[PDB]
Amino acid sequence: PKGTIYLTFSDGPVNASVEVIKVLNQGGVKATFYFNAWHLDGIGDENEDRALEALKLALDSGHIVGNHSYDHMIHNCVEEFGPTSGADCNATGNHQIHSYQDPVRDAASFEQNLITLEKYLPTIRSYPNYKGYELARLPYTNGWRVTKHFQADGLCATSDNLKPWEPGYVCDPANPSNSVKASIQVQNILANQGYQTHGWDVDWAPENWGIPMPANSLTEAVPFLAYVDKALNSCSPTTIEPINSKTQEFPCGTPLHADKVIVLTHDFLFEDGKRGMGATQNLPKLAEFIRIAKEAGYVFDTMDNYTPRWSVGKTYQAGEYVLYQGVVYKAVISHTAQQDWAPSSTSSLWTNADPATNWTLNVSYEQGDIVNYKGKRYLVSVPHVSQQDWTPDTQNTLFTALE
Amino acid sequence: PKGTIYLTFSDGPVNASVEVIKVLNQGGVKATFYFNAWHLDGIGDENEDRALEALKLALDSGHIVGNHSYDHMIHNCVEEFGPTSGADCNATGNHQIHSYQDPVRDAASFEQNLITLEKYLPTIRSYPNYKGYELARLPYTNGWRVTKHFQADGLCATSDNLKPWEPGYVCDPANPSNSVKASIQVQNILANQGYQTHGWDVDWAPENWGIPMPANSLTEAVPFLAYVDKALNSCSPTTIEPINSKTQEFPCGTPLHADKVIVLTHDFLFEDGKRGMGATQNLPKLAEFIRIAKEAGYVFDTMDNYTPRWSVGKTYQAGEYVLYQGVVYKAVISHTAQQDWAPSSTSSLWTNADPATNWTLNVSYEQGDIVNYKGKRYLVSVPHVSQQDWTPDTQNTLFTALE
Numbered sequence: 001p002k003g004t005i006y007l008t009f010s011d012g013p014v015n016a017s018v019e020v021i022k023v024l025n026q027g028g029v030k031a032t033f034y035f036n037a038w039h040l041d042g043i044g045d046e047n048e049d050r051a052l053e054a055l056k057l058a059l060d061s062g063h064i065v066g067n068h069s070y071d072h073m074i075h076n077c078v079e080e081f082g083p084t085s086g087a088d089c090n091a092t093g094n095h096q097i098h099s100y101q102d103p104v105r106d107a108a109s110f111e112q113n114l115i116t117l118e119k120y121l122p123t124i125r126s127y128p129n130y131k132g133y134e135l136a137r138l139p140y141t142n143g144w145r146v147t148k149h150f151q152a153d154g155l156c157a158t159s160d161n162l163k164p165w166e167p168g169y170v171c172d173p174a175n176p177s178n179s180v181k182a183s184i185q186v187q188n189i190l191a192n193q194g195y196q197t198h199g200w201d202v203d204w205a206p207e208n209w210g211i212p213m214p215a216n217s218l219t220e221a222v223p224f225l226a227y228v229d230k231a232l233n234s235c236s237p238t239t240i241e242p243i244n245s246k247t248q249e250f251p252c253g254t255p256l257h258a259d260k261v262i263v264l265t266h267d268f269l270f271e272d273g274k275r276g277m278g279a280t281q282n283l284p285k286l287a288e289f290i291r292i293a294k295e296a297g298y299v300f301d302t303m304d305n306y307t308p309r310w311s312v313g314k315t316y317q318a319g320e321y322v323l324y325q326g327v328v329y330k331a332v333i334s335h336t337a338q339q340d341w342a343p344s345s346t347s348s349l350w351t352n353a354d355p356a357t358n359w360t361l362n363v364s365y366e367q368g369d370i371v372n373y374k375g376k377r378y379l380v381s382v383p384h385v386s387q388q389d390w391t392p393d394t395q396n397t398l399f400t401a402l403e
Numbered sequence: 404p405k406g407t408i409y410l411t412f413s414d415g416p417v418n419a420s421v422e423v424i425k426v427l428n429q430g431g432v433k434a435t436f437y438f439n440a441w442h443l444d445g446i447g448d449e450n451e452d453r454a455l456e457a458l459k460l461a462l463d464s465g466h467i468v469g470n471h472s473y474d475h476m477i478h479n480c481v482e483e484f485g486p487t488s489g490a491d492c493n494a495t496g497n498h499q500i501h502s503y504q505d506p507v508r509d510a511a512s513f514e515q516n517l518i519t520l521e522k523y524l525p526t527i528r529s530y531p532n533y534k535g536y537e538l539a540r541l542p543y544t545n546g547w548r549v550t551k552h553f554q555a556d557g558l559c560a561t562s563d564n565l566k567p568w569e570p571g572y573v574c575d576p577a578n579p580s581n582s583v584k585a586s587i588q589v590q591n592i593l594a595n596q597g598y599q600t601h602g603w604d605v606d607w608a609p610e611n612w613g614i615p616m617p618a619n620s621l622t623e624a625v626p627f628l629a630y631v632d633k634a635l636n637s638c639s640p641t642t643i644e645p646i647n648s649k650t651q652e653f654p655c656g657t658p659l660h661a662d663k664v665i666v667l668t669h670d671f672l673f674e675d676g677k678r679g680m681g682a683t684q685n686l687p688k689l690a691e692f693i694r695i696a697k698e699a700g701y702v703f704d705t706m707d708n709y710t711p712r713w714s715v716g717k718t719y720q721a722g723e724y725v726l727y728q729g730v731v732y733k734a735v736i737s738h739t740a741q742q743d744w745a746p747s748s749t750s751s752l753w754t755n756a757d758p759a760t761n762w763t764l765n766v767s768y769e770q771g772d773i774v775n776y777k778g779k780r781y782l783v784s785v786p787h788v789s790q791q792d793w794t795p796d797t798q799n800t801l802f803t804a805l806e
């Protein structure tokens with residue numbers, strides 16, 4: 001294949017989600033949906049009476065569901081969060097101002113999302129394609145927690161005053177806004193809960209969101225495919241416009257990202273209504289795009305496979321990454337996987353390479369790494385592979401406490 | 404050793420928890436604490452201004468923290484939950500009446516509990532003895548979800564009308580109250596989120612909870628040790644009194660329970676205050692009990708080890724149970740454990756034996772088992788070990804859909 005495309009839809013489930021799902025199904029592909037459950041509560045200020053129907057249809061159809069937080073951080077856009085807050089923030093347009101504030105509260109929003117999903121669909125955990133507790137994406141933010149060495153933030157994603165399309169707006173990646181700094185902490189809290197987070201390469205959207213009637217300004221299928229072609233293997237998160245969609249320190253050429261393109265779009269752009277004629281104009285674009293992307297030799301996949309699943313009978317080179325039971329592992333030596341050689345916290349063939357900061361078993365630590373353990377922070381003084389008896393609090397050779 | 408004692412403390416963290424912890428530490432034992440985070444919000448109606456101090460002290464001292472739900476189900480004791488609800492329910496004493504109503508909301512209370520703990524102590528996931536997301540116990544309820552074949556419920560734990568001690572109160576284990584039925588669904592929901600739950604063998608309690616000043620009438624250290632000796636290998640959950648603390652269908656002689664006694668008590672019974680002189684009278688009892696228990700050849704352990712942890716080097720017999728990363732596994736073949744042979748979803752040496760009902764990989768299913776998959780129920784038609792290709796919806800020779 002020329003490469004792998006990951007279609008990711010954000011900010012559902014809403015009414016328009018239903019027809020998007022039908023189009024994917026007709027096109028013979030699976031996508032990943034990053035949902036905000038407040039639409040199930042009827043308070044997300046969209047046409048969303050069919051929210052639960054959409055949720056069920058996505059899972060019944062085999063699409064992957066991931067976590068985009070409960071309320072899309074709207075609680076940071078208003079003084080007091082309530083049933084009208086979505087409408088209030090829509091009135092002001094202040095979604096990317098002060099978007100992140102208290103990182104502990106903001107991270108908790110991702111757990112609340114799961115509570116609400118499991119309330120409206122009590123059987124949701126009986127679906128393997130429900131990945132709401134493993135896969136996440138932060139509102140507004142092109143940020144990544146993929147492996148121990150594949151992590152990077154969207155350093156201009158959100159603002160402390162002006163919107164990115166407003167005159168006089170300035171971002172200094174070397175000195176991120178307060179909101180961005182909080183978003184980085186959220187990333188880290190989620191990673192320690194076992195989440196991976198992923199951003200995107202290309203966004204099927206208007207030029208920017210200051211743009212009026214945005215649903216009417218989506219790129220056509222063929223030029224969008226051209227844009228995808230340009231993204232492939234060109235470190236798109238660093239070159240993408242506008243500036244608040246950038247991931248500045250994205251690890252260019254990192255092997256896990258080779259021959260892949262992650263597409264962001266939004267369910268609500270496929271609705272005929274207050275944003276334009278989305279369903280009439282954009283659903284056929286999505287249909288056509290899938291078609292011509294396959295002809296060009298692309299295949300489509302989901303974010304639960306972005307990091308490839310460990311597979312018996314596959315030959316791995318040393319340093320290759322696999323995903324196993326929601327945890328990332330890195331091959332210690334080149335070898336062919338056997339049934340009883342699976343990655344684990346004691347495997348000789350793999351080390352845990354999750355993007356977390358809490359001290360963890362079977363991790364190859366490097367000098368300078370900082371770990372959290374029993375409420376304290378330790379510097380790795382001597383590079384080593386962690387094991388159960390070498391805990392930071394009692395191994396003075398390996399770890400030095402800060403500070 | 405004669406046997407293993409598991410001291411389990413319910414309903415903390417409160418002020419009284421602090422000196423309890425000091426006594427455990429002085430006695431050189433570790434214990435398991437089943438906490439309700441509403442005390443950290445200051446609304447649990449106890450002396451709890453030192454709640455956070457207590458939480459931190461328990462974790463710094465190596466004790467295990469388990470999940471007892473956010474509010475101890477007090478939301479089902481009042482018409483509308485708020486800051487006064489603990490006090491309101493303490494005024495009526497209706498805790499065991501309608502204690503469980505909507506199992507989905509009641510289970511969510513356990514998740515809310517973790518949000519609150521991780522809010523007041525943001526570094527709490529850095530403690531390995533934090534087991535809030537793995538180990539639980541239901542308020543009021545001697546209920547168990549340990550393995551696929553070790554599961555049982557407290558069939559008279561809570562009522563649909565009167566207090567258990569009241570005249571007129573009737574309990575029929577063959578026709579459990581609605582509150583009990585709801586609590587059973589709570590167990591199943593928690594199990595499907597990967598929780599184990601455990602009840603207790605003996606309860607260090609007042610003579611009777613029906614009458615005032617319960618802290619004063621706690622059994623002395625020596626006679627309590629005799630209660631423990633008597634409970635050893637005697638299936639105490641079936642013989643325990645009163646009827647409301649019983650686990651009627653507890654699996655007598657089940658292998659994981661051999662030579663073990665789980666003790667229940669409550670932190671608040673060790674406080675000088677509204678329940679009596681608990682600190683003055685009962686702390687010494689606990690100090691003595693630990694001393695003489697050890698002297699009699701008992702060891703003390705924590706609930707994270709109740710199901711023994713898989714350990715490299717140890718030799719296992721076919722049929723033996725281990726715990727590995729919060730998941731219960733059962734040995735397929737007798738062997739000595741090696742580094743590369745951790746139990747998992749692909750191991751040929753172990754099968755998954757978690758107490759869950761959702762279809763799960765690498766489970767040894769038997770004819771008659773019932774599983775949930777993608778929102779539907781299936782009956783196992785022929786015995787087999789589950790694997791990725793053999794999903795219920797595609798294997799009608801192995802599974803039969805239930806209408």
Ligand SMILES: CC(=O)N[C@@H]1[C@@H](O)[C@H](O[C@@H]2O[C@H](CO)[C@@H](O[C@@H]3O[C@H](CO)[C@@H](O)[C@H](O)[C@H]3NC(C)=O)[C@H](O)[C@H]2NC(C)=O)[C@@H](CO)O[C@H]1O
Nearest residue numbers: 010011072095139140141164165203208209210242244245
């Ligand atoms: C300069 C520029 O355009 N930057 C783009 C970012 O704005 C954009 O983030 C997305 O922004 C839009 C608009 O602010 C978000 O849409 C809002 O979503 C909320 C919740 O669904 C909804 O209540 C609002 O109505 C809706 N606003 C409008 C005007 O329709 C959208 O969710 C943001 N994206 C993510 C992943 O959270 C990013 C990504 O498109 O692109 C930048 O170029």
Ligand SMILES: CC(=O)N[C@@H]1[C@@H](O)[C@H](O[C@@H]2O[C@H](CO)[C@@H](O[C@@H]3O[C@H](CO)[C@@H](O)[C@H](O)[C@H]3NC(C)=O)[C@H](O)[C@H]2NC(C)=O)[C@@H](CO)O[C@H]1O
Nearest residue numbers: 413414475493498542543544567568606608612645647648
């Ligand atoms: C008929 C009989 O003896 N039943 C016993 C049960 O009462 C007892 O379960 C525990 O009961 C106590 C007393 O109600 C519960 O205490 C309450 O706990 C809440 C929340 O922490 C607190 O707000 C109330 O003030 C407090 N009541 C009092 C009088 O102090 C306690 O939570 C129950 N236990 C558990 C694990 O949830 C059981 C076990 O001791 O024995 C029964 O026989």
Ligand SMILES: [Mg+2]
Nearest residue numbers: 194195326327
């Ligand atoms: Mg993970």
Ligand SMILES: [Mg+2]
Nearest residue numbers: 597598729730
């Ligand atoms: Mg578990």
Ligand SMILES: [Zn+2]
Nearest residue numbers: 010011139140
């Ligand atoms: Zn979004």
Ligand SMILES: [Zn+2]
Nearest residue numbers: 413414542543
């Ligand atoms: Zn309790």
